[PDB]
Every structure is written in C-alpha cells, then in structure tokens.
C-alpha cells in the first residue's frame, strides 16, 4: 500500500558518498513479498526479527540504498570498521534496524567501465552515526599553495570505482538497502 | 483477474472537446499509475501521457501540452482523459492502461511496463 | 527524443521456426529501460518483456530478450500458430518513444 516498490525495483541509484534517504510511512507494509523472492543473498537483519513484527507498528521507518562494492558487503554492520565502515557510511551500534543486499552486476556493469560511481577515501574528521556529508573540497597536502590545480601538493579526496563484466567474482557490484525502524517515547503515535 | 473498463466508441464534429472514462478493479488503486496510450488507424502506438495516483503530478508528451486534461479520483477508481481543440487528423483508438515505469509515490525510473490494457476506445472526427 | 527503427517492417516467416526480431536507436540506453509490447490482429495490446531481460506473469518460456549498448533482440525459438502479431520496442529512459511495429507472417 505504501512505497516499497520504487525504492527496491528502479534503475537509479545513486553513489555512496551522496547517499539518499526514503522515509516511508502511513501505510501498511507486507513484508511477505521480502522473504522468499529467491533474489536477496544477503537478506541479514538485526536487532528485531522479520516474522513476527506483523503485531509490532511504529513510525521512523527511514530507508537508505545505495551501491557498493562486492567484497566489502559484509563490511557493512552495526560496529564493524574497515574501508567503507569509517569513512563513508558507518551503522550506529546498539542497533534496531535490518539490511538488504543483492547482486546487480547483470545491468549496472557495461563494456569499457562504467566511471560514474566515485566514493569519498580521505577524511580528516570521523562520521557521526545516521550522518552524510559531501563536499569536494581538495586537500593541500604540502607547503605549495593551491588553487585549482592537481599535482604532487594537490588531492582530490574522491576515488572512482572500476567496473568490469570479466573482473571477479568478489569485485562485481551490489546493491543494499538498509531499512532502520526506529520509535519515540510519545504515545499515540502512528502505526504502520 | 483484474477488469479495465472504457466507455463506448464515439463520432465527434471538428471544434467540440471530448472526454473518455477508464475503471479500474481487482487491487488497491493508490499504489499504481495510469497511463494513456493511443494509436492511428494502421499505424503505430503514440504516448498520450501518464497519471500518477496520489499527488496528482503527471508527465505529458511534448506534443499536447495544451490539448488534453487527464484527472483522477481514487474514491471510484476511475481516471478521465479530456481532449480540447481537436482537429480532423484524430481519429484514432484510446488505450488506458496500469503503469509500471515511473512511481506513484517518488516519481523514479523503475523496471517494467504498461502490463495491463483495455477494450479500447474507438474516437472518430469527421466534417 | 530517440530515433527507433525496427526495420523490416515484414519478416513472414514459416511455420514451427524461430525469429530474431531487433530493436535498435541512435544514442546509447542501459539494459533496464525497454519493453516489447504485442499487438494481436483486431484486438488489445499486451506486454510481453519487461527489463529488457525477463518475463512478465504467466508468460511462457519460448519469449526471450537479450542485447544492449544500441542493439537489442527478441528470440522466439518457437512457434505457435497463435502468436502472430505486430511486435512493438518502447523506451522509457528519457521520455518514452515507442517503435515501428513489426508484422510476421505466414511462409508459404
């Protein structure tokens, strides 16, 4: 009844440094359609569990996705660091929500590489959790003054992904989804 | 299962508007667009536009920007095409149709198309 | 706002054989944004492909669909004497553009 379609079964998504949010709410949500569409290899999800849920009903139901490297999918959880983990998308702990993933490597890969997918590498600062920031701002990385030009002394912190068809099985793309269903301490709130 | 319903063939003199009416049934209405589609005689399909089911915001063709009204009500799960200005090269058939290329909630570029039609509706013009 | 031509417009064909029909444009479009759509003779269209790659419901499984980069292709493999129609190719990356229709006919 409410929008789980159109954030699953498009044909754009967007990279991981500019990730987007859906919030999704006032409706009633068949979660029946999540659990055997053979597709998810990697439906794990944490804190409450799937089946049962049908009696629980509360709002927040935010919905993040994006598309991220094969490999460093199981990077991805509630305190666990590495590459990605600490410096573009960071799960917070004490966690409630529940995470999607799938192989999409059948569109999202094209002859020659598809260079359109950039990912931030470099941060001075941490992330604080729920939190995205973007901004290409370069980085003076000696004592040569910069203004616009790229060099030995001149960084752009963003890096550009390579896709490949023949690359390997680990290095495919995939897809995630990352639903949090979070609540207030206020009654009467709406259910879903 | 589901049923597509359209109203009856219709003959219409130059200068005059017309309006024709599509049902819907067999599934919750506010989760799926329409779409309107039609066709010369003989030739093929052409892209009338699409209707979205909740916020009202449509997208139509570059063509009739200004010739054509398409409204929607939710409560009888019936959508209405209207034509204006209509000239004597529109004789053609009408085709609604349940969407699924772009969202009725976002408005994104999903995976699939037009998989549900009509009867058809016959429209002629004549002097 | 994409030049489609199917070409030909005729490819009549025998019975109990296989048809490659084509679909191609002028710019490039991704492996998720087109369809092909039936039309039977004297009656309403239908669907046929979505995604370019896979079937809709309750569609055998003698409909394939393969290509992309400019090119895309519909293979039949088999052929019933009920599955004479035109055959449409529609987009709908940018805008939606539908094609040329294609009709096949008997081979005698």
């Known amino acids: 009844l409410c929008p789980f379609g159109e954030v699953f079964n498009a044909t754009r998504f967007a990279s991981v440094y500019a990730w987007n949010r859906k919030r999704i709410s006032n409706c009633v949500a068949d979660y029946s359609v999540l659990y055997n569409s053979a597709s998810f290899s990697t439906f794990k999800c944490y804190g409450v569990s799937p089946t049962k849920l049908n009696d629980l009903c509360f709002t927040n139901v935010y919905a993040d996705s994006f598309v991220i490297r094969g490999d460093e999918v199981r990077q991805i959880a509630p305190g666990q660091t590495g590459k990605i983990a600490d410096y573009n998308y960071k799960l917070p702990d004490d966690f409630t929500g529940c995470v999607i993933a799938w192989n999409s490597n059948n569109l999202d890969s094209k002859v020659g590489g598809n260079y359109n997918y950039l990912y931030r590498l470099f941060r001075k600062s941490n992330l604080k959790p729920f939190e995205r920031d973007i901004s290409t701002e370069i980085y003076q990385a000696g004592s040569t003054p910069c203004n616009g030009v790229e060099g030995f002394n001149c960084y752009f912190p963003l890096q550009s992904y390579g896709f490949q068809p023949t690359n390997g099985v680990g290095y495919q793309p995939y897809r995630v989804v990352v639903l949090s269903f979070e609540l207030l301490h206020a009654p009467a709130t709406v259910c879903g | 299962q589901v049923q597509l319903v359209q109203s009856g063939a219709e003959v219409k003199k130059p200068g005059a508007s017309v309006k024709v009416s599509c049902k819907a049934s067999?599934?919750?209405?506010?989760?799926?667009?329409i779409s309107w589609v039609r066709q010369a005689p003989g030739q093929g399909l052409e892209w009338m536009g699409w209707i979205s089911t909740y916020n009202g915001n449509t997208n139509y063709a570059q063509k009739f920007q200004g010739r054509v009204t398409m409204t929607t009500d939710t409560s009888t799960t019936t959508g209405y095409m209207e034509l204006r200005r209509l000239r004597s090269d529109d004789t053609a058939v009408y085709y609604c149709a349940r969407d699924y290329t772009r969202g009725a909630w976002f408005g994104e570029s999903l995976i699939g198309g037009f998989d549900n039609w009509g009867q058809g509706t016959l429209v002629t013009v004549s002097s | 706002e994409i030049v489609l031509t199917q070409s030909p417009g005729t490819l009549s064909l025998s019975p109990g054989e296989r048809a490659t029909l084509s679909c191609r444009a002028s710019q490039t479009v991704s492996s998720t944004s087109l369809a092909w759509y039936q039309q039977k003779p004297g009656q309403a269209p239908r669907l046929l492909i979505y995604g370019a790659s896979s079937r809709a419901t309750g569609i055998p499984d003698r409909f394939s669909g393969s290509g992309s980069g400019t090119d895309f292709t519909l293979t039949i493999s088999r052929l019933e004497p009920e599955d004479f129609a035109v055959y449409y190719c529609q987009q709908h990356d940018t805008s939606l553009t539908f094609g040329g229709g294609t009709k096949v006919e008997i081979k005698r």
């Open positions: 067999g599934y919750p209405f506010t989760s799926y667009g």
